[PDB]
Amino acid sequence: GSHMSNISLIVGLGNPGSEYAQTRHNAGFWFVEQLADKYGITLKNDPKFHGISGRGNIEGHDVRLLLPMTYMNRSGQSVVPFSKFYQIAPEAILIAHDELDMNPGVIRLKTGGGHGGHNGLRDIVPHIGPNFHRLRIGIGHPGSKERVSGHVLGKAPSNEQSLMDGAIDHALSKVKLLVQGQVPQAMNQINAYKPA
């Protein structure tokens, strides 16, 4: 199983299919796919857990990666059985997701709290509780509450995309801290990111 707050499961939230791959609500997928390429972790079909998953070494730690393939609002249907099966406590889980309440190019590591309206997180917290860590990848907020679907299911303009891609790249460089259990330091160094 997991051990303390050494992160050993990294989840990226998103929707399946080419039509959603470039949309803001897939920010978490972007992070996890880039992380998997950095470390040479294979993301393979995981029908048992309704997702795509992998396992490999990050900086001398055995870490599992998970992308739910359930659609966003059913993400717990992947995350919860997967973490239970592998005996991974919430304290050892990092979930990367788009965050409407932060600007493109802002990224923060948060431990605990609610879903903040995110319909993927909403499907996870009831089951495992709130005490997992989150990589909140800012995507900006649209005009109104009416506009949220259209904003999260939209493809960001190039400037915003560049801002997010930079922030994601920064976070990748801090995963070593996380898998080593250095959550405080990771929190300080992730949250201090600026794009320019």
GROMACS .gro file of C-alpha atoms in nm:
model
  196
    1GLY     CA    1   0.000   0.000   0.000
    2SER     CA    2   0.103   0.370   0.023
    3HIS     CA    3   0.334   0.494   0.289
    4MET     CA    4   0.276   0.821   0.474
    5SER     CA    5   0.252   1.134   0.249
    6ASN     CA    6   0.501   1.006  -0.002
    7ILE     CA    7   0.282   1.050  -0.309
    8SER     CA    8   0.232   0.716  -0.479
    9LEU     CA    9  -0.080   0.767  -0.687
   10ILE     CA   10  -0.105   1.056  -0.929
   11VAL     CA   11  -0.445   1.100  -1.092
   12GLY     CA   12  -0.523   1.329  -1.384
   13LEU     CA   13  -0.884   1.428  -1.438
   14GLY     CA   14  -1.040   1.473  -1.780
   15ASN     CA   15  -1.280   1.333  -2.039
   16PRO     CA   16  -1.202   1.058  -2.291
   17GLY     CA   17  -1.191   1.101  -2.664
   18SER     CA   18  -1.014   1.319  -2.919
   19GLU     CA   19  -1.295   1.574  -2.903
   20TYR     CA   20  -1.209   1.654  -2.537
   21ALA     CA   21  -0.833   1.607  -2.541
   22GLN     CA   22  -0.751   1.973  -2.599
   23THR     CA   23  -1.015   2.119  -2.376
   24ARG     CA   24  -0.946   2.302  -2.047
   25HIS     CA   25  -1.123   2.032  -1.842
   26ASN     CA   26  -0.844   1.796  -1.949
   27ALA     CA   27  -0.571   1.994  -1.777
   28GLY     CA   28  -0.510   1.707  -1.539
   29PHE     CA   29  -0.466   1.463  -1.826
   30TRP     CA   30  -0.209   1.699  -1.980
   31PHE     CA   31  -0.007   1.698  -1.660
   32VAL     CA   32  -0.017   1.324  -1.606
   33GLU     CA   33   0.059   1.236  -1.971
   34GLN     CA   34   0.358   1.469  -1.964
   35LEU     CA   35   0.471   1.323  -1.632
   36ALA     CA   36   0.442   0.968  -1.768
   37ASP     CA   37   0.659   1.068  -2.069
   38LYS     CA   38   0.918   1.238  -1.849
   39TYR     CA   39   0.966   0.929  -1.635
   40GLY     CA   40   0.902   0.657  -1.894
   41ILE     CA   41   0.583   0.529  -1.728
   42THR     CA   42   0.352   0.339  -1.969
   43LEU     CA   43  -0.009   0.447  -1.961
   44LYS     CA   44  -0.198   0.142  -2.068
   45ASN     CA   45  -0.563   0.032  -2.088
   46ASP     CA   46  -0.703  -0.053  -1.744
   47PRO     CA   47  -1.053  -0.179  -1.805
   48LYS     CA   48  -1.085  -0.323  -1.451
   49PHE     CA   49  -1.065   0.034  -1.311
   50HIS     CA   50  -1.237   0.210  -1.598
   51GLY     CA   51  -0.925   0.405  -1.689
   52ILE     CA   52  -0.582   0.417  -1.836
   53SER     CA   53  -0.306   0.357  -1.576
   54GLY     CA   54   0.059   0.295  -1.528
   55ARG     CA   55   0.318   0.204  -1.279
   56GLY     CA   56   0.687   0.294  -1.268
   57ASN     CA   57   0.970   0.453  -1.083
   58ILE     CA   58   0.987   0.823  -1.011
   59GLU     CA   59   1.308   0.916  -0.840
   60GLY     CA   60   1.343   0.582  -0.671
   61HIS     CA   61   0.979   0.551  -0.563
   62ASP     CA   62   0.717   0.314  -0.704
   63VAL     CA   63   0.432   0.534  -0.827
   64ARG     CA   64   0.102   0.462  -1.003
   65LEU     CA   65  -0.061   0.694  -1.256
   66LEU     CA   66  -0.430   0.702  -1.337
   67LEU     CA   67  -0.649   0.872  -1.598
   68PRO     CA   68  -1.018   0.787  -1.544
   69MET     CA   69  -1.200   0.700  -1.868
   70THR     CA   70  -1.541   0.732  -1.710
   71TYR     CA   71  -1.617   1.090  -1.819
   72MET     CA   72  -1.540   1.363  -1.571
   73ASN     CA   73  -1.856   1.345  -1.354
   74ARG     CA   74  -1.801   0.974  -1.294
   75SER     CA   75  -1.432   0.994  -1.210
   76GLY     CA   76  -1.476   0.838  -0.867
   77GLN     CA   77  -1.591   0.523  -1.038
   78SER     CA   78  -1.222   0.482  -1.139
   79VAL     CA   79  -1.030   0.657  -0.863
   80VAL     CA   80  -1.206   0.504  -0.564
   81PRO     CA   81  -1.181   0.130  -0.655
   82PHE     CA   82  -0.826   0.176  -0.786
   83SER     CA   83  -0.701   0.337  -0.467
   84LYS     CA   84  -0.886   0.082  -0.251
   85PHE     CA   85  -0.750  -0.213  -0.446
   86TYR     CA   86  -0.389  -0.093  -0.416
   87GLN     CA   87  -0.433   0.021  -0.055
   88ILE     CA   88  -0.345   0.379  -0.135
   89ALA     CA   89  -0.455   0.623   0.137
   90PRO     CA   90  -0.579   0.970   0.036
   91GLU     CA   91  -0.273   1.122   0.200
   92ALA     CA   92  -0.057   0.953  -0.066
   93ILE     CA   93  -0.275   1.068  -0.359
   94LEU     CA   94  -0.218   1.369  -0.583
   95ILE     CA   95  -0.507   1.464  -0.813
   96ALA     CA   96  -0.430   1.710  -1.093
   97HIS     CA   97  -0.722   1.910  -1.222
   98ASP     CA   98  -0.834   2.227  -1.389
   99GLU     CA   99  -0.917   2.511  -1.153
  100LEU     CA  100  -1.168   2.774  -1.257
  101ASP     CA  101  -1.078   2.996  -0.958
  102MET     CA  102  -0.722   3.060  -1.074
  103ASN     CA  103  -0.566   3.228  -1.378
  104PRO     CA  104  -0.399   3.040  -1.665
  105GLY     CA  105  -0.039   3.020  -1.562
  106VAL     CA  106  -0.115   2.995  -1.190
  107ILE     CA  107  -0.071   2.653  -1.031
  108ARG     CA  108  -0.101   2.557  -0.668
  109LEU     CA  109  -0.062   2.251  -0.455
  110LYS     CA  110  -0.345   2.219  -0.202
  111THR     CA  111  -0.412   1.956   0.062
  112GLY     CA  112  -0.772   1.910   0.160
  113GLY     CA  113  -1.075   2.130   0.096
  114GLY     CA  114  -1.387   2.077  -0.113
  115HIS     CA  115  -1.448   2.031  -0.481
  116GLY     CA  116  -1.486   2.407  -0.555
  117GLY     CA  117  -1.756   2.319  -0.800
  118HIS     CA  118  -1.542   2.077  -1.000
  119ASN     CA  119  -1.761   1.791  -1.111
  120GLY     CA  120  -1.479   1.538  -1.112
  121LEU     CA  121  -1.366   1.616  -0.760
  122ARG     CA  122  -1.734   1.612  -0.658
  123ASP     CA  123  -1.743   1.243  -0.753
  124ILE     CA  124  -1.434   1.155  -0.543
  125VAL     CA  125  -1.449   1.343  -0.211
  126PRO     CA  126  -1.773   1.170  -0.088
  127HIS     CA  127  -1.593   0.834  -0.095
  128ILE     CA  128  -1.236   0.890   0.013
  129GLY     CA  129  -1.277   1.214   0.193
  130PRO     CA  130  -1.097   1.540   0.132
  131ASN     CA  131  -0.746   1.465   0.263
  132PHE     CA  132  -0.575   1.407  -0.073
  133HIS     CA  133  -0.346   1.654  -0.238
  134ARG     CA  134  -0.447   1.852  -0.547
  135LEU     CA  135  -0.249   2.012  -0.826
  136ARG     CA  136  -0.482   2.300  -0.912
  137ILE     CA  137  -0.400   2.404  -1.270
  138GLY     CA  138  -0.556   2.747  -1.328
  139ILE     CA  139  -0.774   2.773  -1.638
  140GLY     CA  140  -0.959   3.105  -1.565
  141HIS     CA  141  -1.343   3.153  -1.513
  142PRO     CA  142  -1.590   3.239  -1.794
  143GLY     CA  143  -1.841   3.515  -1.788
  144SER     CA  144  -2.112   3.354  -1.558
  145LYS     CA  145  -2.231   3.011  -1.411
  146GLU     CA  146  -2.408   2.958  -1.746
  147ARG     CA  147  -2.091   2.991  -1.922
  148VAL     CA  148  -1.892   2.717  -1.709
  149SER     CA  149  -1.960   2.426  -1.936
  150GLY     CA  150  -1.865   2.622  -2.242
  151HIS     CA  151  -1.548   2.744  -2.083
  152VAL     CA  152  -1.422   2.408  -1.945
  153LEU     CA  153  -1.516   2.227  -2.266
  154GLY     CA  154  -1.344   2.491  -2.476
  155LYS     CA  155  -0.997   2.488  -2.628
  156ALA     CA  156  -0.803   2.779  -2.473
  157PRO     CA  157  -0.655   3.049  -2.697
  158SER     CA  158  -0.282   3.015  -2.760
  159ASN     CA  159  -0.174   3.269  -2.502
  160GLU     CA  160  -0.367   3.096  -2.225
  161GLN     CA  161  -0.248   2.760  -2.345
  162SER     CA  162   0.116   2.873  -2.330
  163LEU     CA  163   0.061   3.004  -1.976
  164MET     CA  164  -0.086   2.672  -1.864
  165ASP     CA  165   0.181   2.468  -2.044
  166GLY     CA  166   0.456   2.666  -1.863
  167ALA     CA  167   0.292   2.613  -1.528
  168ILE     CA  168   0.253   2.242  -1.595
  169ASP     CA  169   0.614   2.213  -1.695
  170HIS     CA  170   0.714   2.378  -1.367
  171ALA     CA  171   0.503   2.136  -1.168
  172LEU     CA  172   0.665   1.838  -1.342
  173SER     CA  173   0.997   1.951  -1.202
  174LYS     CA  174   0.853   1.939  -0.849
  175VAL     CA  175   0.712   1.586  -0.856
  176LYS     CA  176   1.043   1.458  -0.719
  177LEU     CA  177   0.964   1.646  -0.395
  178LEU     CA  178   0.617   1.502  -0.379
  179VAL     CA  179   0.711   1.137  -0.425
  180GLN     CA  180   0.973   1.194  -0.151
  181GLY     CA  181   0.700   1.326   0.089
  182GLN     CA  182   0.830   1.684   0.086
  183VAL     CA  183   0.483   1.829   0.056
  184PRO     CA  184   0.563   2.156   0.236
  185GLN     CA  185   0.856   2.236   0.011
  186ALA     CA  186   0.667   2.131  -0.297
  187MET     CA  187   0.380   2.353  -0.188
  188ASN     CA  188   0.607   2.653  -0.150
  189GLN     CA  189   0.791   2.601  -0.478
  190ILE     CA  190   0.482   2.517  -0.690
  191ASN     CA  191   0.274   2.805  -0.549
  192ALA     CA  192   0.556   3.058  -0.609
  193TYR     CA  193   0.549   2.994  -0.989
  194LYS     CA  194   0.504   3.298  -1.206
  195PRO     CA  195   0.487   3.280  -1.593
  196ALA     CA  196   0.704   3.588  -1.659
   0.00000   0.00000   0.00000
